[PDB]
């Protein structure tokens, strides 16, 4: 088995799921669902569709280059089976995914810094610009 990734939105494709299109130039587009497949047939641009990983990585919603992200590639040169190597791989995969989660949370927090400041500024503008409703509020309280 192999977990593929959708040509359109990059979501995982599991055995039996989705549909594959083979073009005449003999390259295979795997789609996780008919939504992505139909968008491809309509010739929409995934990099423009905000709900796709292509758009997110293009526009900076998430990190595209990272030390954790360099670990996994398609190996075209096989390695001799070695039980110790397999066990080390099984440990390292969990460790790497944990580190990548921490870096992803850090990246999102860095993206979203300033939200509290904007919220306070908008709240201050609203409260200042509406002094008369505070009177009713105090009458209630």
């Amino acid at each position: 088995m192999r977990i593929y990734q959708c040509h359109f939105c990059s979501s995982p494709c599991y055995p039996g799921h989705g549909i594959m299109f083979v073009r005449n130039d003999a390259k295979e587009f795997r789609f996780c669902r008919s939504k992505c497949h139909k968008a491809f047939k309509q010739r929409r641009n995934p990099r423009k569709l905000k709900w796709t990983k292509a758009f997110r990585k293009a526009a900076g919603k998430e990190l595209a280059v990272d030390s954790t992200l360099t670990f996994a590639q398609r190996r075209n040169v096989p390695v001799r089976y070695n039980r110790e190597l397999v066990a080390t791989t099984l440990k390292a995969m969990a460790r790497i995914e944990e580190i990548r989660q921490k870096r992803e949370r850090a990246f999102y927090k860095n993206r979203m810094r300033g939200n509290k400041e904007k919220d306070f500024l908008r709240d201050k503008k609203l409260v200042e610009s509406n002094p008369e409703l505070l009177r009713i509020r105090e009458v209630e309280i």
């Binding site: 055995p15 989705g18 299109f21 083979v22 005449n24 003999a26 295979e28």
Partner: protein, 136 residues
């Protein structure tokens, strides 16, 4: 699977009924292939015979060379637009419908096949496998 095929063939979704025109994907000089019959087709009342990937049909040449026209000849279906399920787990389909001319023993009349050939057709017909450049 008629004469010339290698082993058993599983069921694949039918895409090409009789009276359908597919592309001709070999360098034999034919441009299209019009289906008049499908070999090894079980009979049911009031049902159009149809062909799938890896099938051998009988076809005429509607468009092509004058020498190759006018004669019913065997052809083998190598591509179908109709999606079929591969047993390893994928539903897949090609862009068009395409077949190649052949002799009754399954040997290819032409010299090569252009475009991707279905894996099922290639593994069923050794001459198609020999003359294929791209197998899926």
């Amino acid at each position: 699977s008629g004469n010339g095929a290698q082993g058993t063939k599983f069921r694949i979704s039918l895409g090409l009924p009789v009276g359908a025109i597919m592309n001709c994907a070999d360098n034999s000089g034919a441009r299209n292939l019009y289906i008049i019959a499908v070999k090894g087709s079980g009979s049911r009342l009031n049902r159009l015979p149809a062909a799938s990937l890896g099938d051998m049909v009988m076809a005429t040449v509607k468009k092509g060379k004058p020498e190759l026209r006018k004669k019913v000849m065997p052809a083998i279906v190598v591509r179908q637009a109709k999606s079929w399920r591969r047993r390893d787990g994928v539903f897949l389909y090609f862009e068009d419908n395409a077949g190649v001319i052949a002799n009754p023993k399954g040997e290819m009349k032409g010299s090569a096949i252009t475009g991707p050939v279905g894996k099922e057709c290639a593994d069923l017909w050794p001459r198609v496998a020999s003359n294929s450049g791209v197998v899926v």
